[PDB]
Amino acid sequence: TTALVCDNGSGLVKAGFAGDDAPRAVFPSIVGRPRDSYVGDEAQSKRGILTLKYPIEHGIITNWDDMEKIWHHTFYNELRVAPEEHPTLLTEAPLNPKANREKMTQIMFETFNVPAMYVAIQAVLSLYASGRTTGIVLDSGDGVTHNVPIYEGYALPHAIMRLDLAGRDLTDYLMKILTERGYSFVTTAEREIVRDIKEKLCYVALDFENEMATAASSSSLEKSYELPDGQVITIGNERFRCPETLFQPSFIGMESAGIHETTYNSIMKCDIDIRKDLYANNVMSGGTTMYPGIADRMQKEITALAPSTMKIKIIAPPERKYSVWIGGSILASLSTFQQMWITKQEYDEAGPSIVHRKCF
Ligand SMILES: CO[C@@H](C[C@@H]1OC(=O)C[C@@H](O)C[C@H](O)CC(=O)[C@H](C)[C@H](OC)c2coc(n2)-c2coc(n2)-c2coc(n2)/C=C/CC[C@H]1C)[C@@H](C)CCC(=O)[C@H](C)[C@@H](C/C=C/N(C)CO)OC
Ligand SMILES: Nc1ncnc2c1ncn2[C@@H]1O[C@H](COP(=O)(O)OP(=O)(O)OP(=O)(O)O)[C@@H](O)[C@H]1O
Ligand SMILES: OC[C@H]1O[C@@](CO)(O[C@H]2O[C@H](CO)[C@@H](O)[C@H](O)[C@H]2O)[C@@H](O)[C@@H]1O
Ligand SMILES: [Ca+2]
Numbered sequence: 001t002t003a004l005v006c007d008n009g010s011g012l013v014k015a016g017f018a019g020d021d022a023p024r025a026v027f028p029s030i031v032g033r034p035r036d037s038y039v040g041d042e043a044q045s046k047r048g049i050l051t052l053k054y055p056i057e058h059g060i061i062t063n064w065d066d067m068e069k070i071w072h073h074t075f076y077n078e079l080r081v082a083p084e085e086h087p088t089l090l091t092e093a094p095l096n097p098k099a100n101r102e103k104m105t106q107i108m109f110e111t112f113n114v115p116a117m118y119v120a121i122q123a124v125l126s127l128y129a130s131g132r133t134t135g136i137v138l139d140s141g142d143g144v145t146h147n148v149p150i151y152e153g154y155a156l157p158h159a160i161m162r163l164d165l166a167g168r169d170l171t172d173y174l175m176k177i178l179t180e181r182g183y184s185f186v187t188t189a190e191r192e193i194v195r196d197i198k199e200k201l202c203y204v205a206l207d208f209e210n211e212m213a214t215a216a217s218s219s220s221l222e223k224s225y226e227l228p229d230g231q232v233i234t235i236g237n238e239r240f241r242c243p244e245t246l247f248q249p250s251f252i253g254m255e256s257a258g259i260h261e262t263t264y265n266s267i268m269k270c271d272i273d274i275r276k277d278l279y280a281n282n283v284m285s286g287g288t289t290m291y292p293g294i295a296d297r298m299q300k301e302i303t304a305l306a307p308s309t310m311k312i313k314i315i316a317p318p319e320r321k322y323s324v325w326i327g328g329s330i331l332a333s334l335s336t337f338q339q340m341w342i343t344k345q346e347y348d349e350a351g352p353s354i355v356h357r358k359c360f
Pocket of ligand 2: 008013141142166199288289290
């Protein structure tokens with residue numbers, strides 16, 4: 001038998017088969033209803049007759065009726081499998097409410113009739129995909145950012161930090177900046193154009209002030225992008241002002257510490273005797289960690305916060321848009337993991353609360 005791995009994010013579903021090197025299906029975590037439903041790309045295509053909703057909000061499932069539709073679409077339309085034939089590994093956000101873990105479990109067993117299931121913490125899987133069982137993950141997607149310190153294979157929940165700022169906020173900030181300059185981006189469709197601009201042209205400045213001065217004094221940082229309507233937008237300092245928000249959340253009116261500060265704060269909540277190992281094993285995960293320059297910037301910023309002699313290493317895998325999924329693919333493949341699945345037999349005996357005993 002082959003296990004399935006489903007990694008449900010705020011913006012994108014990543015799904016596939018355990019042992020594969022990448023998710024076979026990657027599509028928007030969007031459900032559209034009329035007035036029975038459409039999912040993902042098809043929903044965006046018919047946005048004019050549908051109300052488009054994201055069932056996961058800052059990494060937490062909030063619309064359960066729509067979430068069930070995403071799962072159904074994943075199994076039957078994208079993967080084209082019979083879920084009753086496959087153990088299924090799902091993922092969850094750090095600090096996911098217990099009730100939600102139970103609900104995921106109930107749905108998978110009673111609606112989809114999976115033979116076995118497990119729910120793993122996303123950041124933990126990313127660490128595994130880097131070949132590590134100890135380290136600190138910065139996981140930043142479309143909806144939420146977490147710092148998750150992990151020791152001997154398990155997250156340290158009391159030291160987890162959360163920032164409700166991630167890729168969609170960065171897209172929205174870029175939309176705002178560009179709209180102010182006279183290129184109106186407001187609709188959901190226009191958001192997808194600006195998302196593309198962000199992904200292609202933005203980067204993290206090593207020294208934000210220095211970069212601002214460079215952009216003020218030359219055209220060396222300008223890049224152009226042709227819109228669907230044929231307008232050519234040129235941006236310079238917007239390229240690095242947009243992701244600077246991760247380090248300076250006040251750019252969008254948030255009072256939160258930036259991601260370097262949250263990384264440091266998380267390390268300082270951990271056992272003093274493991275901090276050295278965390279500093280030497282900072283792993284970046286998620287689409288919002290893809291900006292050029294981000295690892296060098298984080299290296300600089302953590303170096304300024306940490307003790308002077310501390311060895312600091314930032315690991316930024318090329319495949320890190322999919323590190324969570326890949327870590328799942330690895331885990332669900334292992335012989336040592338097969339006794340860890342929750343079986344339907346165990347579920348039929350114990351009910352949804354078995355998830356708390358079997359999954360952490
Ligand atoms: C970090 O150790 C992992 C296991 C070893 O795998 C690795 O080290 C992964 C590296 O090889 C990745 C590399 O650095 C980069 C990579 O290899 C790349 C990312 C590469 O890109 C092309 C890639 C993409 O997909 C894959 N590789 C892929 C998919 O399947 C596999 N690889 C695969 C399936 O089986 C294996 N590999 C087995 C590998 C042997 C080593 C494992 C014992 C890890 C999953 C082990 C986890 C544990 O032991 C847990 C503590 C224990 C209990 C569970 C605890 N929790 C769930 C806690 O929350 O698990 C049973
Ligand atoms: N090259 C890139 N540069 C900047 N951002 C990128 C890049 N590639 C993808 N992104 C952003 O990454 C986000 C998607 O990342 P990912 O799939 O990790 O998030 P998710 O799992 O859907 O959300 P979350 O983990 O927040 O629930 C989107 O905001 C997307 O625009
Ligand atoms: O600087 C970080 C990172 O951004 C990239 C573009 O992705 O380069 C930008 O920044 C450089 C430093 O100012 C500029 O020289 C370059 O022209 C600009 O695009 C990456 O090359 C770099 O790693
Ligand atoms: Ca995610």
